[PDB]
Design a protein around this ligand. Structure first.
Ligand SMILES: CC(C)CN(C[C@@H](O)[C@H](Cc1ccccc1)NC(=O)O[C@H]1CO[C@H]2OCC[C@H]21)S(=O)(=O)c1ccc(N)cc1
Ligand SMILES: [Cl-]
Ligand code: NA
Lengths: 99, 99
């Protein structure tokens, strides 16, 4: 589909068996989701942006369903104010910016 | 242009006759640039990022070229990690997300 940017590009995704609203974010290197449990191993990481850094848990090889497409990637879990779908996952569904 | 997301979607922008590097960011509502001098009066604004809130200077109706595309709108100046071209200006240059 073609998403205009008049409003925040929010989409519904399926991760860890639950539905969540997320923001499609070309300005993000890695996906960040609010606190939730995920299977497998993880390692601590610090990610920063406007306002500073937050500590998150990094899980690799996680399956995320987005717009019918099933993509696999890294997911950071921590105290983020908004769920963000980053380039790490956007590349897998072939998302591109056009103008 | 059609920009893939395997690398950061960085472009060259021109503001105040100066060339700068900026990140095309669909996950941001307003455009934020690192400290620099802009004409006119500014208004206060607080924006919340991944690490919390910060105060910035809001300048309106600023002329800015983005990847060769002319735009005129609001530019926020503050301690951002990188210059970010957000939805307020992406909509002006006719940018959309596609997949
Ligand atoms: C600042 C950029 C270099 C990177 N940011 C992504 C960006 O899209 C965020 C994404 C975002 C969105 C909402 C809340 C927090 C973070 N937007 C943002 O800070 O925008 C602010 C300016 O306009 C406003 O509109 C949204 C809040 C304001 S980030 O949230 O810090 C980030 C950093 C690292 C990772 N892995 C994932 C995300
Ligand atoms: Cl102030
Ligand atoms: Na894993």
């Amino acid at each position: 589909p073609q998403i205009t940017l008049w409003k925040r590009p929010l989409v519904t995704i399926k991760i860890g068996g639950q539905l969540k609203e997320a923001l499609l974010d070309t300005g993000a290197d890695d996906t960040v989701i609010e606190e939730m449990s995920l299977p497998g191993r993880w390692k601590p990481k610090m990610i920063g942006g406007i306002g500073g850094f937050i500590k998150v848990r990094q899980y690799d090889q996680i399956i995320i369903e987005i717009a019918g497409h099933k993509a696999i990637g890294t997911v950071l879990v921590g105290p983020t104010p908004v769920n963000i779908i980053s380039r790490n996952l956007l590349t897998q569904i072939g998302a591109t910016l056009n103008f």
